[PDB]
Write a protein that binds this ligand. Sequence first.
Ligand SMILES: CC(=O)N[C@H]1[C@@H](OC[C@H](N)C(=O)O)O[C@H](CO)[C@H](O)[C@@H]1O[C@@H]1O[C@H](CO)[C@H](O)[C@H](O[C@]2(C(=O)O)C[C@H](O)[C@@H](NC(C)=O)[C@H]([C@H](O)[C@H](O)CO)O2)[C@H]1O
Ligand SMILES: [Ca+2]
Ligand SMILES: [Ca+2]
Lengths: 123, 124
Amino acid sequence: DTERPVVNVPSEITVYRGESFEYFATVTDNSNAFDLAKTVVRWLYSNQPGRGTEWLQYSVTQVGNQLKVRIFGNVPIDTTIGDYTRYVVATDAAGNVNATQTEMGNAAVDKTSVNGQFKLIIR
Amino acid sequence: SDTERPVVNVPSEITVYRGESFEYFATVTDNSNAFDLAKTVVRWLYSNQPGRGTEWLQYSVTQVGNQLKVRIFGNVPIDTTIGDYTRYVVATDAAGNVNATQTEMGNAAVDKTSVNGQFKLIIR
Ligand SMILES: CC(=O)N[C@H]1[C@@H](OC[C@H](N)C(=O)O)O[C@H](CO)[C@H](O)[C@@H]1O[C@@H]1O[C@H](CO)[C@H](O)[C@H](O[C@]2(C(=O)O)C[C@H](O)[C@@H](NC(C)=O)[C@H]([C@H](O)[C@H](O)CO)O2)[C@H]1O
Ligand SMILES: [Ca+2]
Ligand SMILES: [Ca+2]
């Protein structure tokens, strides 16, 4: 298997201070199998949710041949509002990833996006 | 001996504005580093055209080294419908392997999932 998985996520997810949120991303792959230990919702620098979005959580289930990545959390009242680039990073059973760290960095430089990239919009 | 598909790197969203010009770029790689540029296209699901209501969507293809470069550009009519459109970068390697087949594009469309090279044209 040399074909990488493909994530389907809303380009932008809008959340609000003092409120809970729940969104869903879907992942497919030619193999229909995934490495859940290597599937995460994270910011650019590490597998963490990120500064100012420390409360961003995720849960992974599989329904048929598709991953269902739940993107959820509760937004504290004292949150800094703004826009936060985050990523649904998914790995198939063979270790192919939807977006590499180099692809993510290149896209940030060029003000563009990679597969699985989305904006968490806090208002 | 080449069974590995070419891979398109395209922005998942291409945002454009009525009355303005736009320009984005995709790249294509392949283990063989060889392609059929004549079979590389930007198009909608059904056929080889820019798509209903988005016929002003243009593209050009070059090869720089081991990678295809696909310019995605144009001018947006002042009166074009506001909304989102699903389009595709479809590329072919020298061995005839495509990054996404018509069958795969159709199956993905009914499920509302995505294929490699699929992207959303956002008009505002
Ligand atoms: C701080 C910075 O400029 N970082 C760059 C740089 O990163 C590596 C770093 N220098 C290092 O020491 O290792 O280089 C990479 C490319 O390799 C990036 O360009 C990186 O910049 C960040 O890139 C990410 C990519 O997702 C975003 O574009 C970051 O900008 C934003 C965003 O998340 O979209 C802009 C936004 O206005 C900011 N929102 C608020 C509310 O502050 C957010 C946040 O600051 C961060 O997301 C952290 O929560 O960043 C961009 O800074
Ligand atoms: Ca795969
Ligand atoms: Ca190939």
